[PDB]
Each structure stands twice: as structure tokens, then as C-alpha cells.
């Protein structure tokens, strides 16, 4: 299963200057473009080696959209500050995201398209690609905009056509970092507590993508409600880590199994604490 | 491929 | 209006040891607005040259960053990360567990 995304982020700072723009492009997990409006000098830049072999043509046209975007969204933070009568002293934050999921057969299953206002949702790309869904009333005025304008027609083309088409070639150019499947590394540490109980935890090293599931089994049940799981984070190497710890009885140990199920894994594997 | 344009809310 | 302090979580690239130099990271998620400051300090001092990967977010909307820089484990040398944030009264502070 892949997938690719644009995101953006559009910041005030009255006072501070106009309005920070980032916008970024994945593919999976994989950053492979950024543009900064606070850069020396802003352009879509490279941020994957399988993506710096586009030639000029496609970083000129793509740093142009960008920088299109963001006088559009830069306008939008204006809009959105008058729709809720806000403070022009006042900071916003406007995100977007826009993207396309492809199957195991490689044909589009989903696409969208969202926008938040600080932090709360605004205004989304219906699961259709033909309507669109309103969070509030100022959003309301946002929805009929884009009806009015039979916009969804112009993000259905681009979901269906130009993003399906460009993450197949991404996913070509950058085949050995992009589909690849490293299996974690797995191992249970034991922390004792004098005679009485003992933490087990079950780590999960070096994987790619990040979805994965970690559960503790005793004797073959899973302990999930007093099980303490970490957020999935960044090696910072482009893989990720993961650890579930369960606090045991003292000398029960070995009656409790972790259960890790990663893609790179060919079946599902099962540690024991080793005495 | 970014698409061309961002929306006008 | 929404406010989300950030979830902190300080670990190594590789296992700990004593001796061999690491990476230190402090991975900051969860947070909104996207305004924050993070410093990685070496037994209570500011460590310098610390990069942090370009500012994201997740599909619940949240930021997310990650600072790091090289280090060597020791087993007197105490490593923690120093985050301040509108959602925080004052910094708070992680320390380096290399158990987790
Ligand atoms: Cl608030
Ligand atoms: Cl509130
Ligand atoms: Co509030």
C-alpha cells in the first residue's frame, strides 16, 4: 500500500512579518520536497536523492505552483480572519492536505483533500471527490465558494490523473528506499523490582514504514489495558522505533509472549523473555 | 507533482 | 481556542553504551500552535549545533519535530530535553532514560 501528500501551513505573525508558508510532499513517510518562505530563497527544494533527478523544468514548475500557493493561502488567512470577525493583531494557522492512496494492485482506492483553522477542522473533500463537507458556518461560505465554482472537478482530475501517475513514477525512481519493507528488530528487556514484580519491554528497532502492532501475550492473552505503548517515533536514520512495556509478577516472566506484526515481517513473530 | 493551485476559501 | 501541549520523548538512535557515540533525540508531537522551543541539555547544560528535522504535521493536524545531535553515553553523564510551549506554565523538562 502506498500513498503520496502534499501538506501546507500557512502562519500570521502580526508584527513579526507576513505570514509563514511551508508546503511539503510525501511519499509514505518518505519528505521528498519543502519549500519555505522564510528561506534565503524560497523554492521547492529536495528533500529525498530520488526526487533531485527531476530536471530544471520540474523544479521551475514546481516552486512557481508553490509560490502560487502561497499567495493564495496567504490571502485565505485573510479571509478566514474576517469570516470569524478576528483581530488583525491576532496569529492563525491554516493547514491543508491533499493526497491519493493507492492499493496493492496499484489503482487509486482514496483521495482527498482538507483544511483546518487553528487546529480544527475547516472545510473537507468528500470521500466521492464531488462534494464537500463544512465544519462551521464560516466554512459554509467556503463550501458554497468551491460549489459555486465547480472547483472539485479540477481536484478530482489532479487526485485521479496526475497524482495517481507521479507517485507510480516516485515510487520507480526511489524503489529501494520507497518499497522496501525492513523488518523491526525485536527484543524484551527485564526490569526486576525486588521480589515481587518485574517490567517486560517489548522493543521494536529499525522499521520501515512506521505502522506497526505491538501486543503482550500471558499464555496467550493479550494484556492491552495495562499495557504502556509509546507513540511510534523517528530513529532519525529513516526508520522508526517502538517499544510496549507490561509490568509481570516476579517469576512469571515467561508465561507472558509480545506479539510484533510488521510488513517487512514474513509472519507475525512472538518474543520471550529470555532468564 | 503538487497540484497547480491551492483553493480560494 | 485549541491548544495542544506537546508530547515529549527523549531516546538514542542505537542502544545505549557507555563509550560509543549516539545521536540523542528529542522527538516533540502533538502540539498546537506550531510556535515551540526545544534545547537537548548535557547534565543540566544548553548542548550547541543541535539540528532538528523540518517542521510537519499529522493527520490529526498536531506538529510534530525532531532535534538531535551526536553524543557519547556515560554512566555520569545525564542527558534531558528542555521544552517551552504557549500550552506551559514554565519549560519542562525530560530526562534520558536509555531504558526507554
Ligand atoms: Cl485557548
Ligand atoms: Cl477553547
Ligand atoms: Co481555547
Known amino acids: 500500500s502506498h500513498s503520496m501528500r502534499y501538506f501546507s501551513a500557512a502562519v500570521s505573525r502580526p508584527g513579526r512579518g507576513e ?50 500557493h502561497a499567495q493564495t493561502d496567504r490571502m485565505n488567512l485573510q479571509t478566514l480572519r474576517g469570516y470569524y470577525n478576528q483581530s488583525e493583531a491576532s496569529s492563525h494557522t491554516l493547514q491543508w492536505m491533499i493526497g491519493c492512496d493507492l492499493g496493492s494492485d496499484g489503482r487509486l482506492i482514496r483521495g ?33 465558494k468551491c460549489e459555486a465554482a465547480n472547483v472539485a472537478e479540477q481536484r478530482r482530475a489532479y487526485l485521479e490523473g496526475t497524482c495517481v501517475e507521479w507517485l507510480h513514477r516516485y515510487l520507480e525512481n526511489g524503489k529501494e528506499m520507497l518499497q522496501r519493507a525492513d523488518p523491526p528488530k525485536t527484543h524484551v528487556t527485564h526490569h526486576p523490582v525486588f521480589d515481587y514484580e518485574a517490567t517486560l519491554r517489548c522493543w521494536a528497532l529499525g522499521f520501515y514504514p512506521a505502522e506497526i502492532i505491538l501486543t503482550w501475550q500471558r499464555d496467550g492473552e493479550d494484556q492491552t489495558q495495562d499495557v504502556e ?31 510484533v506484526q510488521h510488513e517487512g515481517l514474513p509472519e507475525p513473530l512472538m518474543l520471550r523473555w529470555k532468564q | 507533482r503538487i497540484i497547480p493551485r491551492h483553493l480560494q476559501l | 481556542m485549541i491548544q495542544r501541549t506537546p508530547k515529549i520523548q527523549v531516546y538514542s538512535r542505537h542502544p545505549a553504551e557507555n563509550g560509543k557515540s549516539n545521536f ?21 547544560e544548553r548542548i550547541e549545533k543541535v539540528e532538528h528535522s523540518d517542521l510537519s504535521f499529522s493527520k490529526d493536524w498536531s506538529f510534530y519535530l525532531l532535534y538531535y545531535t551526536e553524543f557519547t553515553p556515560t554512566e555520569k553523564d545525564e542527558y534531558a530535553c528542555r521544552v517551552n510551549h504557549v500550552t506551559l506554565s514554565q519549560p519542562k523538562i525530560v530526562k534520558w532514560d536509555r531504558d526507554m
Not at chain 1, 510525501?26 to 519555505?36: K, P
Open chain 1, 19 to 68: 505570514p509563514r508558508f511551508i508546503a511539503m510532499g510525501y511519499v509514505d513517510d518518505t519528505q521528498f520536497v519543502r519549500f519555505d518562505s522564510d528561506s534565503a530563497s524560497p523554492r521547492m527544494e529536495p528533500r529525498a536523492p530520488w526526487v533531485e533527478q527531476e530536471g530544471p523544468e520540474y523544479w521551475e514548475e514546481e516552486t512557481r505552483n508553490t509560490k502560487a
Open chain 1, 229 to 259: 505503548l509509546v507513540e511510534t517515533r523517528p530513529a532519525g536514520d529513516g526508520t522508526f522505533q517502538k517499544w510496549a512495556a507490561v509490568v509481570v509478577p516476579s517469576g512469571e516472566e515467561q508465561r507472558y509472549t509480545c506479539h
Open chain 3, 24 to 44: 540523542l533525540n528529542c522527538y516533540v508531537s502533538g502540539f498546537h500552535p506550531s510556535d515551540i522551543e526545544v534545547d537537548l541539555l548535557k547534565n543540566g
Open chain 1, 112 to 144: 482527498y483533500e482538507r483544511y483546518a483553522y487553528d487546529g480544527k477542522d475547516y472545510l473537507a473533500l468528500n470521500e466521492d471527490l464531488r462534494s464537500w463537507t463544512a465544519a462551521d458556518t464560516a466554512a459554509q461560505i467556503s463550501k458554497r
